[PDB]
RNA sequence: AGUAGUAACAAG
């Protein structure tokens, strides 16, 4: 009965395989090279590579947020005492004063002698949170007798290009620091040599991310929403202010607190996962905004003074951004840390596998080198049209910063580019070892991957450099071509 | 009736049975078994007994 | 010099390096207000893959019915609908040919299970589409309902104990003229507020009564309640997914059970094995068909993936399956297995809330309900809603439901559908052709191995069994699925390359607090960290490291940190006070902010256990005191090994919803909690072993109470008086 | 409490709502009713749990004489209104002392997990490939293992006796255990849920599939994350008590696995007691395993003849243990019809037996022949005894009327349960009219009807260098080749105390490790293959490889290998990558054709499943190259030829795969069709032909 | 405003 429908049944179904070559694997997202689009914005919760912490010198012992806050304003005074600014930049829909006037707000309300974090309701910052922005609910029998009333068409995410501040991103916070953030508590007594092992390796691996400046900008991320969580469910009805805390500690082991601003939240009556909080981001930066001005369409920035690092004044900056989150985003925030684990497995299993080879534990080899062998090198980017090699922390911090940037840009436009990319990543492996693969519907594929492209900056600059690394292989490709034939 | 008859068992300090008893005297302490033939008493008596 | 992620690839295959690509750090993707439009979606493109076949309107419940089964052949690479029932047969002949005792002992093993099975066995489904509220409920609180709704119409199947009677008055209430049932209702109290209109609607519930006729009643009885799926990972939009209510899930038991017995024996089911055993079973099938390669020809390995799985696969075709399968066994379990096809193919789907509508100028918004969708100009709905209430008009219901007779939104049936998917690749070869294929499948994901003599034959071979596939409702997504030479492949998520490499991003998510309480979280946390590094190739370093990340987030979230530790909080004041009052210091447990002596050595042991000769006796007396107040009433998805201390304590139920008082719900709940709780006093074996019995619940602790007055007095226990006041009390009951 | 039950049920039924809850609902229906939950499954507990903690009063208290205990508030801080977890921690520090004795009685499983780790001594660590088996295993050690049926009634007789319904066999059988455990579980003040949980847990089996290499036992896989990786060994020791059985397994195991390599090498016999000196089963050595149990089978009777000591010609079928009295067996594979209707894969065994036999109790005299039950003189004991001596004897010989009356294993678990098929099928005859002799029937009596063949009665070498035992006569007893091939997981830790453990290796522990050592030494084997002719092919190391090898594939692939690798050396086409692929195959005696010329090959099998091959012309499994990148990749791991690479070699394949072949240019339609390992052997010298190297690559060669 | 993205929240 199969065979004989099967014969019956149209030719036009069919699955119609065609091999796959590397001329046929054209560069994904062809827009995002367009200049005629508006380059990506820089959309995230807080700052990263451009964060300034105004740095104040503890005994190496925690302490409350405003009384933290308190004493490193108290520090650099100059600019807590800022009344007569400099406006350098505006968002579109901002205003100048209630973001300002909200300001001096936090700030006086933080430097006081009373305990109370709480900010006024003011019409400032009633703005600011957004209050009585929601839509009354009314009857259904009403509705349908009003004509005016109609369903929304619903807001589609924009379609935007590269912007070279994502690269800047990536490289900044892959680099080395001397600045220990992590907060890694104790464990048991090391008995077996595998736990000898471990615990030797640990020095290695996580010194190598625990200095560099993803881990800083990560555990900011990490107690910022751990307060704010708290403080959205003990205080739902009042406004407060939260501080942009972080502790950390240097080579020699003298620890400094951060301060890197001040945020504003709003009310918070959350009862479903999904339902936000406002949250007005004010941060301190060296960064001018007018260098690269279209990373900075959404912040409002004022320039507040300076301090003298090298052998000049500085600019210091106030960039600040009326925000929001919800209570998965925040749960998620106090789970960024596993980025440490998606990261140092990845590497340890290069490691171990590299151990098989040799006989012996080639932890040492692989960072720094030994006797036998040289260090391990991998392909870490690119410098004018040309392979550079990096060592292998460096490609730990690349790795590390890789997942931490999944968090930071984490959402529906991520998921389904790297999950429909992959099938196209496996299909380049294929041509790769000359498994000959093939392909039944290649435009298909393309759908599935370039719908996600939109507005997320990670996946827009992913979709560069998956076409930048493709040129690179289809160099290399030219070698194999040419084999045995 | 289970219940009963390992509640007593165990209670009194002797082994449960391991069909299920019909009635139980309490001075006695030993289970009874009930049975109603129609011919013969000595025929059905025997085939209980083994 | 600018960095690059995924240069990496360089150096790194991307198997090896897969990990990386699933960013699971991140936050997944949540869905917002209405899956109306989702559910829509759906029920029109379920019916646009079936709409030329045949169309009726049913007798029984006044609906649309399609019909794609024995219908036209497609013509063209969209989803077919439009199964042929002998080409099914065919497939299913071919299975029992090389299998042959196999479908009337999966039977036999099915029937006999049946028969053993009780009533109880339905309460652990997760959620259940209560038919008395229409709203999803748990299976054991959705099945309570229905027991004590069908005793009100004459129908006491469940008080005999087993599946069968209470299966048999289910069947039966449909042919009842009426069906009288306890409900629930609001109850409407202003009070008032601070905001805007300034008052409040303080909604107050309770059980009430209600009376529904015949057609009314076989209609929610037939009903699926449809959602959105929150939290799907890899996907850029999002879904709807149903929920079927407690009357189909007895006869669905037993449709998998069946199915279940087949899938096991079947060498190339991915179902119902799964992890280590799965690994096992998939890496002897590849190894086959390496070794099993012509000298010259190739093997080639498709990394599949079939679109519109649910949508397409029609309850005809299942019903015909089960048909099939039962040949052998008499005639009442032939019909038992049959019920469940029924259902599915008469079925009826639930739209959600409904759509809202706003004006923007006003700032007003209003829900218009499913009933009330058409009560309004389709003008002012938007563009894209527009058209799709215009397709759904001739399935449309008056009560605001949707018919739905092809497809299976989300079907319950993935072993019955495996076993078809089994079939596919049954055949292996058509037309005597220069290949033999075969597969791995695993409901909707498959793989299919193709061995010939040239890759021209192979991709013939391919296009053989993608057209085999639209006889029997599958669809393979070209766009989606892919091929190669063996070698290397994708399979539910697992990635061959000569072998299954680990993938430690799938994982990641459970590394964190479980949420269960204190003492059992530490037992999970470490066995996690425990068992990835025996299955998904952690190693020590990255082990020990998530030993010191799992300490981290379970100090700052049960507020637990070292008592040497200057943090401040509530329970931290306390906590800094037995760190100075106990002596042996490593004795305490993590939550009372002692020090973490867990390494990878000793994970498998309970930490109670680990620290119990440090500890102080005053100490470790409070900590197990045999009647504290925290450990509440326990009773014997995985399992771990903690011992039952202080911290294993209970939360709170979610009872504080939107002004709403539900005084009343809670005493339906402590009602049944006060009976229960008497009968594990009166019988302490009811929380280990399931109590029998067909007899009444009094009956059972009155006549144990009566022998335990009784043995108590004569044994010596009770008085004259206190025996005689005992008598006189059961004498009332 | 009798009457305090009886006050709260009357009480109790005074409320019209619960009495009618309590006259409705069924036993069967308390189930239903317990779970009765009005409110919501939660979706995200991980969430809630941290949103939870952030408020006040998130745990709950039980009502009771000792809730009352806690204050409203301590030092400013609520503690309870429903509680905080601040109540928690005041309830640890300034709390009832109450009582904990019989704890560790209670909780003993979990001690002994502790005092397993504590009292253990651990190894060495050492980096390199492991085979890892995905098979079920035993999670944890347990008193006495039970089915979950069976261990709940014993459960129920310890804590709840009043409860137990019908007494059932397992009360009887099981009864000094419960015995024990009702002495232990008595004084303390723990709850019985509590406890019924601690006896499960000791009693009903978890078993689970998990990746094992070399260590099956529970004792062992409790903590088998720390034993072994994909990348790495760690020898660890486990303290405690140690099963006779377990040993008894990696015993057979150890003797097996030595036994595999030391037939390759010129006088085996020197390797077998080399190794089988320095083996440690755990930490016992295998002298002392061999010399204590009395058991074992062929490979240990070989091993203890090598070392020499007493040989226990002995045979354990599961509960059946037999003593060879006379005669020798061999296996062969044939496919028998079972009663049932399918066809089945079996080993019978040939010649004439004879066995001194011993179930239990009861004990008895074998005869058999090739599938046949010729006698069978056996005493009286209990019933279970002789039954299961009748049965267990009936399968292990194999006849045909224990076949049509429905692997060997499976067998023997079906008619332990279900005899009554057995006994019918095999039929019955006249009992002996001796005065000793007497027969029995089916339900284990003295009858006149016995069955056939059964009676039952009241009265009671040196080894050679190729491991092979002969008696003084001169006829041979075991055999080199006498072994099974079956390459089953050890059951406790086996450790080979010597610098080249690695030789008792897995497949591909031994072809990594191989090519491996090739690698390393290729500056001085590449060197000396322009100087050495034939000094080279012989190493010590590719002794090793050849094992893996199947013996009669071994010396052609030589003879393939050797002349492959002469025409690198002779002609001026040497390729690396190939050199390194087919060295380890040269180290066996070759074995050409009947011409001259060697066999040509495609791919080169090895042992143990079909991923297991070298492939000649295409990459593999086990073997491949990439010459983009220079990486080698062997069994998953990637190792570099960059800098051992010649300049010339940039030059086909084609050259180098078939033995007196050479690439004159490249594919001609006009010959035809690619010509296969048959047709190209049966060419003349001088004669050209169409060759696919691997599909995308085809080539034009000549003899 | 903003979060966010095929529809919500911005208290009921």
């Known amino acids: 009965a199969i065979e004989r429908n099967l014969a019956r049944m149209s030719p036009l179904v069919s699955v119609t395989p065609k091999k796959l070559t590397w001329e046929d694997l054209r560069p994904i997202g062809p827009h995002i090279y367009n200049h005629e689009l508006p380059e990506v914005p820089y959309n995230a919760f807080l700052l990263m590579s451009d964060e300034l912490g105004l740095a104040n010198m503890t005994e190496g012992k925690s302490k409350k947020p405003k009384t933290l806050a308190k004493e490193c304003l108290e520090k650099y005074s100059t600019l807590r005492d800022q009344t007569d600014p400099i406006l350098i930049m505006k968002s579109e829909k901002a205003n100048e004063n209630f973001l300002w006037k909200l300001w001096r707000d936090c700030v006086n309300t933080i430097s006081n002698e009373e305990m109370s974090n709480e900010l006024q309701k003011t019409n400032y910052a009633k703005w600011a949170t957004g209050d009585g922005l929601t839509y009354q609910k009314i009857m259904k029998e009403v509705a349908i007798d009003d004509e005016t009333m109609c369903q929304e068409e619903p807001k589609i995410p924009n379609k935007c290009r590269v912007a070279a501040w994502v690269q800047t991103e990536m490289n900044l916070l892959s680099t080395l620091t001397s600045k220990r953030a992590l907060d890694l508590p104790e464990i048991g007594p090391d008995v077996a040599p595998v736990e000898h092992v471990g615990s030797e390796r640990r020095k290695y691996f996580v010194n190598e991310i625990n200095y560099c400046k993803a881990s800083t900008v990560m555990m900011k991320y990490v107690l910022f929403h751990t307060s704010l969580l708290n403080e959205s469910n003990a205080s739902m009805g009042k406004y407060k202010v939260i501080p942009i805390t972080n502790r950390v500690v240097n080579e020699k082991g003298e620890s400094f607190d951060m301060l890197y601003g001040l945020a504003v939240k709003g009310q918070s009556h959350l009862r479903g996962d999904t339902d936000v909080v406002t949250v007005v981001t004010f941060e301190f930066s060296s960064t001018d905004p007018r260098v690269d001005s279209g990373k900075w369409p959404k912040y409002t920035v004022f320039r507040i003074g300076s301090l003298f690092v090298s052998g000049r004044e500085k600019s210091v900056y106030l960039y600040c951004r009326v925000n929001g989150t919800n209570k998965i985003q925040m749960k998620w925030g106090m789970e960024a840390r596993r980025c440490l684990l998606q990261s140092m497995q990845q590497m340890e299993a290069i490691v171990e596998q590299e151990s098989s080879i040799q006989g012996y534990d080639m932890t040492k080899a692989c960072f720094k080198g030994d006797r036998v062998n040289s260090p391990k090198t991998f392909s870490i980017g690119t410098q004018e049209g040309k392979l550079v090699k990096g060592s292998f922390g460096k490609a730990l911090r690349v790795i590390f910063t890789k997942c931490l940037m999944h968090y930071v840009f984490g959402n529906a436009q991520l998921e389904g580019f790297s999950a429909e990319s992959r099938r196209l990543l496996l299909l380049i492996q294929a041509l790769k070892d000359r498994k000959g693969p093939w392909v039944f519907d290649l435009e298909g594929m393309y759908s599935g991957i370039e719908e996600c492209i939109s507005n997320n900056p990670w996946v827009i600059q992913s979709a560069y450099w998956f076409n930048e690394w493709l040129g690179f292989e289809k160099e290399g490709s030219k070698v194999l071509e040419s084999v045995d034939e | 009736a289970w219940m009963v008859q390992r509640s007593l068992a165990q209670e009194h300090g002797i082994e449960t049975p391991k069909y299920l008893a019909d009635l139980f005297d309490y001075k006695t302490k030993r289970f009874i078994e009930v049975g109603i033939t129609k011919g013969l008493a000595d025929d059905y008596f025997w085939k209980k007994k083994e | 010099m600018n960095i690059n992620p995924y240069f990496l690839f360089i150096d790194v295959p991307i198997q090896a390096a897969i990990s990386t690509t699933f960013p699971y750090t991140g936050v997944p993707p949540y869905s917002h207000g209405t899956g109306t439009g989702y559910t829509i979606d759906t029920v029109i493109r379920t019916h646009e893959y079936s709409n030329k076949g045949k169309q009726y309107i049913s007798d029984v419940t006044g609906c649309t019915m399609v019909d794609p089964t024995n219908g036209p052949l497609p013509e063209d690479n969209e989803p077919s609908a439009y199964a042929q029932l002998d080409c099914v047969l065919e497939a299913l002949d071919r299975m029992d040919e090389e299998h042959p005792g196999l479908f009337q002992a999966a039977s036999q093993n099915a029937m006999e299970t049946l028969m053993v099975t009780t009533v109880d066995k339905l309460t652990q489904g997760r959620q259940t589409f209560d038919w008395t509220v229409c709203r999803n409920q748990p299976a054991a609180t959705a099945l309570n309902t229905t027991i004590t709704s069908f005793r009100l119409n004459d129908l006491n199947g469940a008080d005999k104990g087993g599946l069968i009677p209470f299966c048999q008055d289910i069947i039966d209430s449909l042919d009842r003229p009426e069906m009288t049932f306890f409900s629930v209702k609001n109850i409407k109290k202003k009070l008032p507020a601070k905001n805007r209109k300034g008052f409040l609607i303080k909604r107050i519930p309770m059980k009430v009564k209600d009376k529904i006729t015949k057609v009314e009643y076989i209609k929610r009885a037939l009903s699926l309640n449809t959602m959105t799926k929150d939290a799907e990972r890899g996907k850029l939009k999002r879904r709807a997914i149903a929920t079927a209510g407690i009357q189909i899930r007895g006869f669905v038991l037993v449709v998998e059970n069946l199915a279940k017995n087949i899938c096991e024996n079947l060498e190339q089911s991915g179902l119902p094995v799964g992890g280590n055993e799965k690994k096992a079973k998939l890496s002897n099938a590849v190894a086959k068909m390496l070794s099993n390669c012509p000298p010259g020809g190739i093997s080639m390995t498709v990394t599949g993936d079939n679109t519109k799985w649910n949508e397409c696969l029609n309850p005809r075709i299942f019903l015909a399956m089960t048909e099939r399968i039962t040949r052998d066994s008499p005639i009442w379990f032939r019909d038992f297995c049959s019920i469940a096809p029924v259902l599915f193919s008469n079925k009826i789907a639930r739209l959600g809330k409904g759509f809202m509508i706003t004006s923007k100028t006003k700032r007003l918004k209003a829900q218009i309900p499913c009933p009330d969708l058409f009560s309004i100009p389709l003008e002012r709905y938007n563009e894209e809603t527009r058209a799709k209430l215009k397709k759904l008009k001739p399935f449309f219901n008056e009560e605001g439901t949707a018919s739905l007779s092809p497809g299976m939104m989300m079907g319950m049936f993935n072993m019955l559908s495996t076993v078809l998917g089994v079939a596919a690749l049954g055949i292996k070869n058509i037309g005597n052709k220069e290949y033999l294929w075969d597969g791995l499948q695993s409901s909707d994901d498959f793989a299919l191995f193709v061995n010939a003599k040239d890759e021209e034959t192979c991709m013939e071979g391919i296009n053989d069994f993608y057209r085999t596939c639209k006889l029997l409702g599958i669809n393979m997504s070209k766009k989606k699925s892919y091929c190669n030479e063996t070698g290397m492949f994708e399979f539910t998520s697992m990635f061959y390359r000569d072998g299954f490499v680990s993938n430690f991003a799938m994982e990641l998510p459970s590394f964190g607090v479980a949420g269960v309480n204190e003492s059992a979280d530490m037992a999970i946390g470490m066995t996690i960290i425990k068992n990835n590094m025996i299955n998904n190739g952690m190693g020590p370093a990255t082990a020990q490291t998530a030993i010191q990340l799992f300490i981290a987030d379970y100090r700052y979230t049960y507020k637990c940190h070292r008592g040497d530790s200057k943090v401040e909080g509530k329970r931290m004041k306390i906590i800094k006070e037995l760190w100075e009052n106990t002596k042996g210091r490593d004795g305490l447990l993590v939550a009372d902010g002692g020090p973490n002596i867990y390494n990878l050595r000793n994970l498998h042991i309970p930490e109670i256990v680990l620290k119990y000769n440090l500890m102080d006796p005053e100490y470790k007396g409070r900590l197990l005191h045999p009647q504290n107040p925290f450990v509440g009433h326990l009773s014997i998805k995985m399992d771990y090994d903690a011992v039952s201390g202080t911290h294993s304590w209970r939360t709170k139920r979610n009872r504080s919803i939107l002004n709403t008082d539900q005084r009343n719900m809670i005493l339906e709940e402590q009602c049944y909690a006060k009976c229960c709780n008497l009968f594990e006093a009166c019988f302490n074996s009811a929380s280990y072993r399931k109590p029998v019995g067909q007899h009444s619940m009094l009956e059972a602790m009155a006549h144990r109470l009566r022998m335990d007055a009784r043995l108590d007095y004569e044994s010596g226990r009770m008085s004259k008086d206190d025996f005689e006041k005992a008598m006189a009390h059961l004498g009332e009951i | ?703």
């Open chain 4, 1 to 703: 409490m009798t009457l305090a039950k009886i006050e709260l049920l009357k009480q109790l039924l005074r409320d019209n709502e619960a009495k009618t809850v309590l006259k409705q609902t069924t036993v069967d229906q308390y189930n239903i009713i317990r779970k009765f939950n009005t409110s919501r499954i939660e979706k995200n507990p991980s969430l809630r749990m941290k949103w939870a903690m952030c408020s006040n009063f998130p745990l709950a208290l039980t009502k009771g004489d000792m809730a009352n205990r806690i204050p409203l508030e301590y030092k400013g801080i609520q503690l309870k209104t429903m509680c905080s977890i601040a109540a928690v921690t005041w309830w640890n520090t300034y709390g009832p002392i109450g009582d904990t004795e019989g704890f560790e009685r209670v909780y003993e499983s979990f001690f002994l997990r502790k005092m397993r780790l504590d009292n253990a001594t651990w190894g060495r660590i050492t980096f390199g490939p492991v085979e890892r088996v995905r098979k079920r295993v035993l999670l944890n050690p347990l008193t006495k293992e039970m089915p979950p049926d069976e261990a709940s009634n014993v459960i129920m007789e310890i804590l709840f006796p009043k409860e137990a319904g019908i007494p059932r066999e397992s009360t009887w059988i099981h009864r000094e255990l419960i015995k024990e455990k009702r002495e232990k579980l008595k004084g303390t003040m723990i709850t019985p849920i509590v406890l019924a949980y601690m006896l499960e847990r000791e009693l009903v089996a978890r078993r689970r599939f998990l990746p094992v290499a070399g260590a099956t036992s529970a004792e062992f896989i409790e903590m088998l994350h720390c034993l072994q990786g994909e990348n790495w060994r760690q020898i660890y020791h486990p303290g405690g008590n140690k099963l006779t059985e377990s040993r008894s397994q990696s015993m057979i195991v150890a003797c097996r696995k030595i036994i595999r390599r030391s037939i390759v090498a010129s006088n085996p016999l020197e390797l077998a007691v080399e190794i089988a000196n320095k083996t440690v089963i755990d930490t016992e050595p295998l002298k002392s395993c061999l010399a204590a149990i009395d058991g074992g089978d062929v490979a240990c009777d070989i091993i203890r003849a090598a070392l020499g000591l007493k040989i226990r010609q002995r045979q354990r079928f599961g509960r059946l243990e037999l003593k060879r009295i006379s005669g020798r067996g061999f296996k062969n594979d044939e496919e028998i019809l079972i009663g049932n209707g399918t066809i089945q894969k079996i080993g019978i065994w040939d010649g004439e037996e004879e066995f001194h036999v011993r179930c239990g109790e009861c004990r008895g005299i074998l005869k058999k022949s090739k599938m046949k039950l010729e006698k069978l003189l056996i005493n009286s004991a209990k019933k279970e005894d002789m039954r299961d001596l009748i049965i267990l004897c009936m399968v292990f010989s194999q006849d045909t009327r224990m076949f049509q009356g429905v692997p060997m294993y499976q067998l023997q678990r079906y008619f332990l349960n279900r005899s009554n098929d057995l006994f019918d099928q095999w039929g019955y005859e006249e009992s002996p009219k001796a005065s000793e002799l007497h027969g029995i029937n089916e339900s284990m009596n003295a009858s006149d009807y016995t069955l056939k063949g059964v009676v039952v009665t009241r009265n009671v070498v040196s080894i050679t260098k190729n491991l092979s035992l002969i008696k003084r006569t001169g006829e041979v007893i075991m055999g080199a080749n006498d072994v099974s091939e079956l390459e089953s997981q050890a059951q406790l830790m086996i450790t080979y105390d010597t610098p080249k453990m690695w030789e008792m290796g897995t497949t591909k522990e031994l072809v990594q490790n191989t090519y491996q050592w090739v690698l390393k030494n290729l500056v001085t084997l590449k060197a000396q293959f322009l100087l050495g002719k034939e000094d080279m092919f012989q190493w010590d190391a590719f002794e090793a490889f050849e094992s893996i090898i199947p013996q009669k594939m071994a010396g052609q692939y030589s003879g393939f290998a050797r002349a492959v690798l002469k025409q690198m050396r002779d002609q001026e086409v040497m390729k690396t990558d190939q050199f390194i692929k087919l060295l380890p195959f040269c180290f066996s005696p070759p074995k050409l054709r009947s011409n001259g010329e060697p066999y040509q090959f495609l791919k080169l099998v090895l042992k143990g499943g079909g991923e297991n091959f070298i492939e000649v012309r295409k990459g593999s499994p086990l073997f491949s190259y990439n010459p983009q990148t220079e990486v080698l990749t062997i069994c998953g791991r990637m190792m570099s030829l960059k800098g051992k690479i010649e300049d010339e070699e940039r030059r086909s394949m084609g050259n180098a795969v078939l033995a007196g072949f050479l690439v004159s240019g490249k594919y001609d339609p006009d010959l035809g069709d690619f010509k296969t390992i048959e047709e190209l052997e049966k060419l003349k010298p001088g004669e050209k032909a169409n060759i696919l190297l691997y599909q995308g690559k085809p080539v034009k060669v000549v003899k």
